[PDB]
Amino acid sequence: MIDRNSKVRILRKESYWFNQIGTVATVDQSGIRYPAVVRFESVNYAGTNTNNFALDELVEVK
Amino acid sequence: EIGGLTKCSESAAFTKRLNASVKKLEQRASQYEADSPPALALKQQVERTQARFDKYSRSELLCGADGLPHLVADGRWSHAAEFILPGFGFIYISGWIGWVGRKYLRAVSTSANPSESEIIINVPLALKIMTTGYIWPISAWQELISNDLVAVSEEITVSP
Amino acid sequence: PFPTFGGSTGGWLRAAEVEEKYAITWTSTKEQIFEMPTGGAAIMRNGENLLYLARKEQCLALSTQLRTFKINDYKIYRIFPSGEVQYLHPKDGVFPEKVNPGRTSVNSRGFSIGKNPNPASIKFSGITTYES
Amino acid sequence: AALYTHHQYIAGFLMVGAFAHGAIFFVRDYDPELNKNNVLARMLEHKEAIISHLSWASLFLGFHTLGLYIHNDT
Amino acid sequence: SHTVKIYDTCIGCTQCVRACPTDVLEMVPWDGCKSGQIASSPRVEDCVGCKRCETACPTDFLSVRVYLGAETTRSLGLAY
Amino acid sequence: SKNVQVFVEKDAVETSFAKWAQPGHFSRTLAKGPKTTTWIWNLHADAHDFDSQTSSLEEVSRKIFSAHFGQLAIIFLWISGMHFHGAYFSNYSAWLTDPISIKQSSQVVWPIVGQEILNADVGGNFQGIQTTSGWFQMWRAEGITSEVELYWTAIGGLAMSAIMLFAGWFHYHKAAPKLEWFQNAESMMNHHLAGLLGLGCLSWSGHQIHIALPINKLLDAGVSPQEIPLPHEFLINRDLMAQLYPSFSKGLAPFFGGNWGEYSDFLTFKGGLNPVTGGLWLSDIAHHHLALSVLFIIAGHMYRTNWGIGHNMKEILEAHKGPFTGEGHKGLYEILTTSWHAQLAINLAMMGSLSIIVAHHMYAMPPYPYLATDYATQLSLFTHHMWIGGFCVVGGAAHGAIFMVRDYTPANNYNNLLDRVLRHRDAIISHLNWVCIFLGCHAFGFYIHNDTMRALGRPQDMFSDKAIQLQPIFAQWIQNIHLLAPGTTAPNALATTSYAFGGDVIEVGGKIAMMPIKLGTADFMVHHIHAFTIHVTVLILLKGVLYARSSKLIPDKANLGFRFPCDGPGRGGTCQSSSWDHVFLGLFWMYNSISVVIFHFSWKMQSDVWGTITPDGAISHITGGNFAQSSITINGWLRDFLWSQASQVIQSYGSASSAYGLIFLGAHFIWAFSLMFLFSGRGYWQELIESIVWAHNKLNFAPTIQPRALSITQGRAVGLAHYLLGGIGTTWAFFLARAISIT
Amino acid sequence: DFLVHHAIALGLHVTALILVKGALDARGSKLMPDKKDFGYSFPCDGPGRGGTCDISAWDAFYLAMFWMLNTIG
Amino acid sequence: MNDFQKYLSTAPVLLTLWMTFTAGFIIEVNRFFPDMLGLY
Ligand code: CLA
Ligand code: CLA
Ligand code: CLA
Ligand code: CLA
Ligand code: CLA
Ligand code: CLA
Ligand SMILES: CC1=C(/C=C/C(C)=C/C=C/C(C)=C/C=C/C=C(C)/C=C/C=C(C)/C=C/C2=C(C)CCCC2(C)C)C(C)(C)CCC1
């Protein structure tokens, strides 16, 4: 399940980290469109290591 | 012979090349004299030339009309020394290098700083891993049949 | 109220007189030297200042420099050949980087960039996928 | 001599154009849904494999061909 | 001239509107993000096509996309 | 207290190897660590940009001083090696005895893999590579004679190298000067113009007068090297010197008295070239340096330091202002005393310009014994110094632009010359553009016209000395002036400064050393082409300096920096609009310019100067005088020059010149290789890398330092680098191989 | 003849690589996952994300032309 | 010492040393076993 410190696999095809594993940092509960904040160990082509995804775009890996 | 070639031991052109080459060096040596350091060098060079041609002559190499050795690589073991046997050497060494490299990368991947260990190699570990590559053929096969070598669609792919 | 400048060959051309022109205005508390986008150095006046340029970008570039001098009262206008003037920046009085209640969204698509339609689907339509 | 060089050059242009229009097709006329699990779609699924292997082939041929030529020259 | 579109993945970082060289973008009130703000492109008639905005976006894939199109004196940056 | 004092901080930086193990320490960004391959490249590209590594001028200045010591150490080691190789791996002794026959050689290859073929039969019972740097001639002029002496100078070099390296460490880690010390231009100029140059010249004159002159006279006369007295003997026994030069008998008494005339024996103004060696008379060279020494020492007493008398540069600069130039030169002093980049610009441009002058003056007036007849060495030196010069000149422009983007301050430059220049930049660039077009159309048009005419069977309509002729009247006039100068405008001289202007043919060993070089229509055409090439180079470079901070297209270019890839695909396209890119393009034109110049030298000389002359007056030039009617068309250059003079390299296989053939081919390869970086873009490569990485991942392994494609700017740099190496390398081999044969 | 034939092989393979990659990576890539919305030929996608020069499919044709000429040569 | 060893463990330095060693051994082999176009 998506929750703090959980590990998930990205399912957004446009993501640099598609089919890769990241750690959910925090999940906002205010109804924002993309609540989960996942952090990755690899920088993207822009140099970022984090992005916000929706719960459906994330599948828990364990 | 294969391809209408002739054995170098029986090729006149091959011999002509030898004579000509030696003559050139000897003509040069004539200018210098006796034990002059230049002359001694040229003299030693002719010895090497004579040896090279002799080695090729005693070999199974096949020469063409130009009198130059031509190599055969169709799989026949008669001329395996030309390509097959040397080929095994390359494969063994190349695999060794690749296997050990992959091993080190995967090994240091789980370290405190996986990127510092790629720019500043941990020599002690590297040497250990490097020595363990002599049996790379066996290890690789074992890893393949254990589903530990090839990954399974859990890797990043393009948008389309 | 023109700042003190000696002239340059990098000023405006005919377009400024026949197509369109721009103007920036600001107020200073001291006379200081600034660099003008056209090329060269000029001295602003102690008070109101007005300068004419040929492009909006040139005007906004100067504004950036002005902010360094701690001047944030700049205004940019576009003067047409007939004399008509359009106030352009700050448009609503509040700089664009600061959310101002009363501003409506424009050109917004409610989905991720990857949810745009396929080009083949809109063939012979005249519209583009990103406008579809 | 002229005829051979003439047709071979024309052939090259014709070949390159084919691949060019093939790409134009993918960008403009390809329907992902119609060709579901089609022979064409699956080609775009293992694109990396095709490109990577073609790369290896090019490298192998390039290194050894040039290497052998330079050996002979030296 | 050019077309600039903003997507729901915006986070209201304001970085884009702070990078535009010609004031084409603005920050408008919104509720889809924690910041409570989204970017808009009210004045695309002044876009030069620099794409500085895109370079500033922090989202995985740009939430602000600039599609180059018809060219005018303003878009071609012609001072003459 | 004193205006000029020494201020130094003790123990400024601790010496340790810790930072060595922390790559990227100099930069804040790089220090964080490597995450992509770009970090690696950036580490090497920002290594010596101290301005970005620190914000204090004092620190930047300190690093520069120490770094310079490092270069000096390297240079000393280089010179040391050359002398050593000339002592243990050379045929100097044999050449010294018979300079005309034996060929110079100072490099020998080990007998590995048939590479021994490269060891040629140069002569003197020695086999090695024929060197072309001109060391032997220089050593002879100095009066070396032995190989023991060469060994000792080598040892001195090593020692000096070490001293410099210590100095670098000392003045950075133990005694680092403060900024106030560095900012003392008047003192520095006084010291460098009187001590470094003045005392240097005087010291050299001493060696030439007491050691070189006497020994060389004996050598020329015929005395065997072994029979010539050792150098110290001449210094002690005045009688020996008196025999050669009969004025040393009088001693230094004439000097302290005003009778400097008595020293006419060794201090002379003969002019021309020594008939025996084919080089300038050493007596004249001695007077040259002595005279220059006096001038420099006097000049070193022009600026104020701590005694009131002197000039203050600031005052001089500020006073020089006029009706058309506003505040004039006000503000320049501060710029040149607070910006290293500005100083480098001027200094680098002048240094490069000097190299080009050296190339011209060193062939027309051969300075060393037995150099002119060695065509290989002559060609090598001319081309070498021509190149060094071109690079330096372009570099000056580059650093000038870095100044405008990083150090220029509008406040300190109001209505000064710089400001006024940047205020009419459009006019300057517009006019230069026209000048370039005019020259280019007219100059190159001449060649195209001629080609068409000759091909159409209409030779009478060509711009040739046999048809419509374009004679260089002005130059022809100056030549006559210089020819008739000796005895008229230069009464005390005895001969022309150079035989190029006019005179007789000086021959040494049956080979022509110098001969009057005439100028005709072909020369006019080529000279004007040189003008076109240089002018275009200036356009690109100057545009970069003037439009470095801003432009109508990108009004805020300054903030973007000196080296940015672009501003975007907008405004119709803003690719390559940085000042760095202007330098990038300028180098290509510099390559073209220098290439044409060196080719002109090679063909003109081999056609109208170099060659052999019989005992009677029969001159046979190497190429036969083809330059006049063949260099007037492009086909001529392709056939009578490149195609014909390349017969040597292409047919070098199986000989000691085989290396040149291989390098010729290798250089072509590298040149072509570069075109893939210059025509392609990062996007294609990045995507290809993605697919390749997929493969590695599919096998469960991939680098943490994610592989990325080279940056846009780096791509251009890599391309230019390989392009230049390949082009220059090709000519290098072509020239050297051809020269060896012609010699 | 052996060597020259292998050189021709290199040409065909490398020319093909450029062209094939262009076709497959014409509807999108990791650098530009939305390439299909820009078309067959576009200048670039900006100086960001590392630099996106020659990223369109048209550029593949442009690059392949040179190799085609080389191989035919 | 430890720090110096780290510098000597840097990628550039190690490559040069390794390649020098590799080059050397290849050269030495050719010095003692020269002119070979096949395993005899
Ligand atoms: C052979 C290749 C070639 C040629 C011909 C040119 C030509 C030119 N380059 Mg160029 N360039 C080249 C390669 C070449 N480039 C390469 C490889 C690079 C990469 C580094 C560059 C980079 C470069 C830069 C960065 C600059 C130039 C500039 C110039 C122009 C100089 C002005 C001039 O002399 O106009 C004359 C042009 C001629 C071609 C002369 C010959 C034409 C005939 C003989 C004259 C008469 C013809 C008449 C006008 C019309 C005839 C009618 C009929 C034929 C239809 C000129 C258009 C400069 C420029 O534009 O400033 C002015 C400039 O800044 N070049
Ligand atoms: C039956 C053959 C055929 C047909 C019908 C088409 C048809 C088409 N192609 Mg195509 N193409 C072909 C062969 C063909 N092509 C081949 C063989 C190639 C490989 C080179 C290409 C490569 C290609 C590309 C790369 C592109 C097209 C495009 C197009 C479309 C627009 C063409 C256009 O805008 O041109 C308009 C008219 C012109 C361009 C005039 C051409 C002027 C040429 C370039 C210069 C002439 C040479 C020179 C002047 C000679 C002077 C020398 C003298 C001094 C001696 C159109 C549907 C374009 C497209 O987007 O389609 C979607 C596109 O981008 N094609
Ligand atoms: C002389 C010019 C030249 C050369 C040599 C190359 C070489 C190459 N290009 Mg290329 N290219 C060029 C001009 C050139 N290009 C130009 C002008 C363009 C503009 C159209 C392009 C456009 C282009 C594209 C679009 C692509 C290439 C690709 C390639 C590579 C193909 C694979 C290959 O041959 O591997 C072998 C490579 C070489 C032999 C060259 C390097 C050789 C060095 C010296 C190493 C030699 C090692 C030696 C054998 C000994 C090794 C052991 C030793 C360490 C002890 C190769 C590196 C393709 C690529 O990326 O590859 C997959 C590709 O997609 N090029
Ligand atoms: C400009 C400087 C210079 C240059 C270019 C050369 C060039 C040459 N010299 Mg020479 N030399 C020089 C200065 C120079 N020398 C000086 C100053 C001296 C006086 C000491 C000598 C004394 C000298 C002798 C006595 C001999 C040469 C020889 C040679 C030739 C073979 C070089 C060699 O050893 O290859 C082979 C190279 C090696 C054996 C060195 C091994 C490679 C090392 C290990 C790589 C470096 C490791 C790396 C830096 C690690 C970094 C660690 C970090 C702390 C930096 C070569 C042409 C030889 C020759 O011509 O014989 C016929 C020869 O016998 N030279
Ligand atoms: C008369 C005194 C004197 C002399 C000879 C020099 C000489 C030099 N200075 Mg200098 N300097 C001086 C005073 C002097 N300076 C003063 C007073 C200041 C402060 C205002 C400076 C500040 C200064 C800076 C900031 C820099 C120099 C640099 C240089 C060098 C320029 C490079 C060159 O030409 O290489 C020629 C090289 C040589 C001739 C090699 C020999 C060099 C030694 C040190 C000569 C010393 C005298 C020598 C032992 C002979 C003694 C005579 C005896 C045998 C009888 C050069 C060695 C630059 C440099 O690269 O420094 C490292 C530099 O950046 N100087
Ligand atoms: C007195 C000479 C001198 C000095 C002190 C400097 C000093 C400087 N220059 Mg500069 N420059 C010079 C001459 C000089 N330059 C000349 C002559 C040119 C024209 C080509 C330039 C062009 C130039 C540009 C275009 C730039 C600089 C920059 C810089 C700064 C950083 C340098 C850097 O990145 O270090 C790192 C140094 C390197 C990476 C160089 C390594 C050598 C490379 C790999 C080429 C090697 C070629 C080699 C000889 C070929 C061997 C062939 C063999 C392998 C077969 C620094 C202040 C840069 C800057 O940012 O300034 C603020 C910058 O952008 N300079
Ligand atoms: C009879 C015979 C023979 C033959 C055999 C065979 C069977 C062969 C084959 C061959 C082949 C089989 C070839 C092929 C080729 C192919 C190609 C050349 C292809 C191309 C392709 C393309 C170009 C593509 C395109 C595209 C794209 C890109 C995408 C999609 C769309 C399109 C389709 C457009 C032999 C030898 C003689 C001998 C015996 C008998």
Ligand code: SF4
């Ligand atoms: S492309 Fe440039 S002008 Fe257009 S919105 Fe982005 S930053 Fe502003």
Ligand code: SF4
């Ligand atoms: S930079 Fe991107 S995420 Fe930030 S406000 Fe602009 S569009 Fe939204």
Ligand code: SF4
């Ligand atoms: S990536 Fe290349 S084409 Fe695109 S904006 Fe940058 S420099 Fe221009």
